[PDB]
Design a protein around this ligand. Structure first.
Ligand SMILES: [Zn+2]
Lengths: 186, 98
DNA sequence: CCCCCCCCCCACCCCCCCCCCCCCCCCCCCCCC
DNA sequence: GGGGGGGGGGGGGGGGGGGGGTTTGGGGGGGGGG
């Protein structure tokens, strides 16, 4: 049931790391979309047998020598070149969520967190949105770890041309609509 | 009784590999089919029509070396190896045997 | 119109790299067939 | 007279070691008040 409960940001303590929590707050900032490599594809110049590296961290080191049996058995130390055509990219975006101004205890600074969102779920958020977000609360390499929330699901807090006839048919609509402008004002 | 210590291996164009199916039998299978020479083309293009097949075959056989260096290796093993001599003389012996 | 204000601008581990050593290959020379 | 084997040189690989990776004051420009 814990994933159902909307936590304020300052309730997200270290013991939650690894859990599919749900957080509540205001988005104070949103990144522009950028691509990130899921799998790098390298061509091999001297044999044409491509090879692949999967990336699973904020950084990586690129391959140099052709590890494929096509080169390795021929002991042919061919050179590898990255191809953006064949590499699988995924859409990446970061958003900073802050607790609601009402939730801040008296005298504390409002606490905030990085949300990372990937794939088709990108650009579901915008600054000034007040929102509930489900995600995996995770560490990142900085013993103190950096931390972020991998977003998974989002809940934002927030025919006619026939229907206009309902007011037109009732008549004197200019006078009435003008009288409908701020009726509490004398 | 003893745990291993590593030593770097090395590979070079052995006459056995040169006599594998993708070796000279590949040349016999494919050279007369793929090289074509004609008065309809200039000398540079005709030379290229030879060189392209031998280069592709050389790379597919032994991709490590450059084509000229491969050719020097081939000329020198041709100068030396007895089984390769028996194969080459067997080719011209087969042509005699026709 | 003149003076004061205020605003701006500026001063420990991991990778790359290099050095050292050992082995293997290739050529040359000599002997054997 | 040519091919094999022995011996010496030269090059390449692999390992090991090492080093690097914001406040305060002052002048001048620009704008506002007496
Ligand atoms: Zn390759």
């Amino acid at each position: 049931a814990i994933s159902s409960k909307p936590l304020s940001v300052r309730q997200i303590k270290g013991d939650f790391l690894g859990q599919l929590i749900t957080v509540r707050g205001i988005i104070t900032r949103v990144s522009d979309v950028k691509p990130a490599v899921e799998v790098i594809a390298y061509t091999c110049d001297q044999c044409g047998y491509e090879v692949f590296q999967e990336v699973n961290s904020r950084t990586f080191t690129p391959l140099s020598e052709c590890t494929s049996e096509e080169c390795s058995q021929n002991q042919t130390k061919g050179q590898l070149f990255m191809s953006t055509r064949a590499s699988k990219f995924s859409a990446f975006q970061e958003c900073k969520i802050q607790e609601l101004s009402q939730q801040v205890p008296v005298g504390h600074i409002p606490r905030s967190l990085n949300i990372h969102v990937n794939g088709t779920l990108v650009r579901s958020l915008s600054p000034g949105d007040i929102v509930d977000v489900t995600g995996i609360f995770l560490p990142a390499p900085y013993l103190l770890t950096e931390t972020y929330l991998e977003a998974q699901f989002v809940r934002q807090h927030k025919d006619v041309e026939e229907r206009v006839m309902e007011l037109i048919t009732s008549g004197d609509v200019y006078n009435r609509l003008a009288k409908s402008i701020a009726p509490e004002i004398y | 009784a003893i745990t291993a210590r590593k030593r770097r291996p090395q590979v070079k164009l052995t006459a056995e590999k040169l006599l594998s199916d993708k070796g000279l039998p590949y040349v016999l299978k494919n050279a007369h089919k793929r090289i074509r020479i004609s008065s309809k083309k200039n000398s540079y293009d005709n030379l290229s029509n030879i060189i392209q097949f031998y280069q592709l075959w050389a790379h597919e056989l032994f991709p490590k070396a450059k084509f000229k260096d491969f050719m020097k290796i081939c000329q020198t093993v041709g100068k030396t190896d007895p089984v390769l001599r028996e194969y080459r003389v067997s080719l011209f012996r087969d042509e005699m045997g026709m």
